[PDB]
Paper text:
Although most chaperones are standalone proteins, [name] (IcmF) has a G-protein domain covalently attached to its target mutase. IcmF catalyzes the 1,2-rearrangement of isobutyryl-CoA to n-butyryl-CoA, as well as pivalyl-CoA and isovaleryl-CoA, using AdoCbl. Here, we show that the G-protein domain in a fused system forms a similar active conformation, requiring IcmF oligomerization. Cryo-EM structural analysis reveals that the second protomer of the G-protein intermolecular dimer props open the mutase active site using residues of switch III as a wedge, allowing for AdoCbl insertion or damaged Cbl removal.
With 500 μM of the nonhydrolyzable GTP analog, [name], long chains of IcmF protomers are observed, with all visible IcmF protomers comprising these filamentous-like chains. To further investigate the structures of IcmF’s supramolecular complexes, we prepared cryogenic EM grids and collected datasets of C. metallidurans wt IcmF with [name] and butyryl-CoA (wt IcmF + [name]) and Q341A IcmF with GTP (Q341A IcmF + GTP). For the wt IcmF + [name] dataset, the supramolecular complexes were first manually picked on the micrographs, extracted using helical parameters, and processed as a single particle dataset. Signal subtraction was utilized to remove the extra density that was due to the extraction of single particles from a continuous helical particle. Local B factor postprocessing was performed to yield a 6.7-Å resolution reconstruction. However, due to the lower resolution of the wt IcmF + [name] reconstruction, there is no clear density for [name] in the nucleotide-binding site. The G-protein domain interface adopts the same conformation as observed for MeaB in the [name]-MeaB:MCMCbl complex structure. For both reconstructions, we observed an open conformation of the mutase active site. In terms of maturation, the formation of the supramolecular complexes made up of apo-IcmF molecules with [name] (right) invokes an assembly line model in which a chain of open mutases can be filled in succession by an ATR that moves down the chain, delivering AdoCbl as it is synthesized.
Numbering used by the authors:
A (entry chain B): 22 to 591, 593 to 904, 907 to 1010, 1019 to 1093
B (entry chain C): 299 to 378
C (entry chain A): 538 to 591, 593 to 616
The structure:
Amino acid sequence: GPANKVRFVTAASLFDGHDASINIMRRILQSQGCEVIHLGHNRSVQEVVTAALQEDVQGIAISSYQGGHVEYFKYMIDLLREHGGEHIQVFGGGGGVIVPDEIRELQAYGVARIYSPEDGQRMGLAGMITDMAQRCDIDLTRYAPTTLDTVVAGDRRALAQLITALENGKADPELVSALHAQAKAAAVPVLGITGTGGAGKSSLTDELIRRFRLDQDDALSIAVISIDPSRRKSGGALLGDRIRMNAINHPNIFMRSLATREAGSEISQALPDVIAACKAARFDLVIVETSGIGQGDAAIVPHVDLSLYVMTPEFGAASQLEKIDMLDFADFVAINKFDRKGAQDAWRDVAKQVQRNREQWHSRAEDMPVYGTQASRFNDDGVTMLYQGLVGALGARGMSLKPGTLPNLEGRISTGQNVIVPPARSRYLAELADTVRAYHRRVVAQSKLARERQQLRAAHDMLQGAGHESAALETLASERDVSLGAVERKLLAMWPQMQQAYSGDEYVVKIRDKEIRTGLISTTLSGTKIRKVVLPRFEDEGEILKWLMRENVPGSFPYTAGVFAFKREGDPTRMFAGEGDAFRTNRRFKLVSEGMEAKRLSTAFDSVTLYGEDPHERPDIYGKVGNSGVSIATLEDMKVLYDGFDLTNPSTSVSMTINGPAPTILAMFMNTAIDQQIDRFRADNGRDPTADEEAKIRAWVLQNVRGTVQADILKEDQGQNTCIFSTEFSLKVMGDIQEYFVHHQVRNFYSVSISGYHIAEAGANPISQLAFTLANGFTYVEAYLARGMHIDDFAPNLSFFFSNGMDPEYSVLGRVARRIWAVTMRDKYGANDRSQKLKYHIQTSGRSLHAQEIDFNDIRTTLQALIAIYDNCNSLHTNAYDITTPTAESVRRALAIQLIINREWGVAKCENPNQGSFLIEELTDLVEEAVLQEFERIAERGGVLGAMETGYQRGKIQEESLYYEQLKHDGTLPIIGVNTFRNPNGLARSSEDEKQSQLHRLTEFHGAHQADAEAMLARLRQAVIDNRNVFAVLMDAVRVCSLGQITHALFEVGGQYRRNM
Amino acid sequence: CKAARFDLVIVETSGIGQGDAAIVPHVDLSLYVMTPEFGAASQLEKIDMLDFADFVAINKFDRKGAQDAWRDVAKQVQRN
Amino acid sequence: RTGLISTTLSGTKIRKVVLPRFEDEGEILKWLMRENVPGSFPYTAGVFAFKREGDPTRMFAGEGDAFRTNRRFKLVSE
């Protein structure tokens, strides 16, 4: 029970994906009656400190679930003691990450308060909350400014103390009326923004602020005040509107979040005084967001100079406008979230209604200053049109403003252009599932017809063999012969030869002009001859054809037995290695790639690079520099990293793991590949290669461009929820660079990486993982199809990665996926078979893999590998902790297992370990049906776009985790070594000097490009404004810009993700 | 209405806001009507009358997301 | 009466033994003559039609004199 209004802040550290615990914590806090401004996850320390200082909050709540917090705590304490934040309480708690030794270190350091897991369990959360709240009983009235110097200068701390005085009424009322007089002499613009809270008005304000920043060159002093209703029961409120604001990145731009603090009134009673304070604070513009509005309230309109109303297409009947007197006084009206149906009709109706109200029959209703807009889509045309209309109104309102530097885009309606998804394309998933059903139906029908024909045939033969002359038999047989389908009859016709061709001990293939004859006989120690693939030996043809249609031989559509007709011959020991600087990594490569014919390198990076984070003098990342991955600053670092390794060699394979800035790294890789050849030719000639030599190098690189990239932006959004770029724009860039590749006929490189590894590690049931992956891949196909690209051109290069768990579902799941994939390619699009064949990678179980009794987990992994061997996996992966070092002991065990599979298993010499079992096919079909059902469920939910928009997969993983953990705790789930058979008896760091050297290299790169930095910025902005294929611009910018600069520019353009959910 | 020996009395409220719950003490039971479109789920913290509505109805079940709306609102009132 | 349905974590119904669903009867008879259900002649699929339900910890134990062996059994067969 605080005497005053207490303000608290909860937030998560940078690079944090898990915030549900802090979410429930903040729920309890606001339930207690605490006013909290939460900033979500991955928030800059400087940004959070600035926000807290400008908002003048009383307490700070911290949840540190990822470690490394100590730097942030120390820096924040130093800054608070530096900027008068010692009296502002700071509280933290992050579970068991803080070791009790670390707890003692923090306590002796001088931390305000750290909550131990033992303390959290014993004392309880409510008691701690009450203790803190009663502890925050501090008087801020002594902090109120006594003079007018701070107010005139614009000290927003002084203005916040003034707001507190207004709340307490302790301000000198004569001084307040004098402030009103000063505002009357000032008269700076005040914009009233009216509409429902959280509808997207924050995104609109963010985009408009960004537009004004770019047009007027960051020259606007913007003061923002938000008033929100107070929960009459609790008395507190969560000021969750500043959180969506991200374009406030300017010291002279200020924002304040406030409550109504009135039991009956929905607005603050001192709001005009706040307006006068902002006007006298020498702010070039004041923007106000209203609270939850009713029907006939129009109190804010006379208190502001311009009125802006926010509306949505959903408003009920058109007669609901007959009761909105607020709209009778709204100077500007905008229809928010134009993505829903009927929006254009409603716009026409409202325009007609306004025309009737104003009796302006001589004017055009569509020309009225009311626009329909969709806030979620970036670069919205209606947003630019409304900004232009606002500029025109300000000119009409007599606003001395700098001339517009932006092109004058015409119109009044956002057209939804650059919409990757075709609006109608959507329910494609149900279409595909129905196609699968129809394929099954047709297969059954054809099998039945062919069986009937065969039965009639043999019956006639026996009867004609019995001597009886019956002409009805041949007529009836012919009735089925024409009924028999042509393609099936062709497949029916092929049975005798292939049956005989594979009956022998050796298969011969005269390929092109040469011949490929390979023996088919395998011999055991007892001398028994083993055919590698043995076919069913049935007599009746109906079931034969049914099998063939449903299950062909390997290498035959739909490649159910695998894509490759015969097993690959052969040690693809993947060389995954990377840490520290270039020198250590190159030494390690020399260790691994010493005298190796085929270079198969796998490259990992630190999250700082994986997040595209520029190295910074802030210690927040300093402990993370060179940790768990190589931090790259410039192209030369990569070129040195690739010194002495002939990447143009066809046996040289490199697999790098990054998703977001991956095109930038690929551009750098192209630079390195070209530079190697150019420098070699220059040394070979003692002269610079000419433009003809440049074109020759270009064509040669296009010929020999080979590589693998582990990029998947989507999966970060599914499990980390840390994505920063709009996935729409990211996939647009993906399409642009893919278009470059097609235009450049890139044929040997691989950049797409679709996986379920984090999906599987999330605890996702395999069926859902499969279905979601299929949806994502086919939506990618549609997007590329929405790009007007031939399906067959890029499908062969499309890649997949899977993780294999324990359930009996995993037994055939890969085969089912292969079977459905081919028919999806064939029926819907009919791309060439080379596109229809699937390539994939398989990973063992990681979710069931645990340090708790890993010894038996190894034997479980044996079972895991069993199926993938029977499933004939083309690529098997065993997870590496690279956390503890992935020691060579595990690799020794895994390679031993692989060799045992390859040789020691005689059953492995067969190539059809699963064909025949009725259990197998029944499991297959039931799994098929279940996957279809899930597809229909997601298709019925508004497609992948809606499922991601609302968080469908979030609920999926939540339910799966809850059910699994309940089975685990109940003991119903039997677990070896945990729930059963209990035991009767029972870190790489880089020197800071290396980081400083790399930082010096990067700054020298900046110093090499500081004079030409303006040219690079202009080039970037030219790429930005036209919304073209940026990679063309990126091809040269990478040579003159660091990746951190690129990310900064991408965030500056407005591509930053706003936590608006 | 009560003294007129009327067996059941029905009242339709006028325009409402976020926190006003004035009619609830003036009535024996409380009923609210809502629609599937709700913007963010945080707006439930704005509806103080939701903490006191004896009954709630989600009109126009036709729009998408209404079922997940049921799930989330049911969880929210469960926590309430 | 013994249930034939088995349930997995995903709730999938599993029949412990599933016969072929062939259409022709000749190959059906061929199989039945060559392979019957468990508990049917010639019991290729095992004598017991249904799997034994159950802890076969065989106590292999003997060494030394009678007294030491009996103490060992006391340890094992307590």
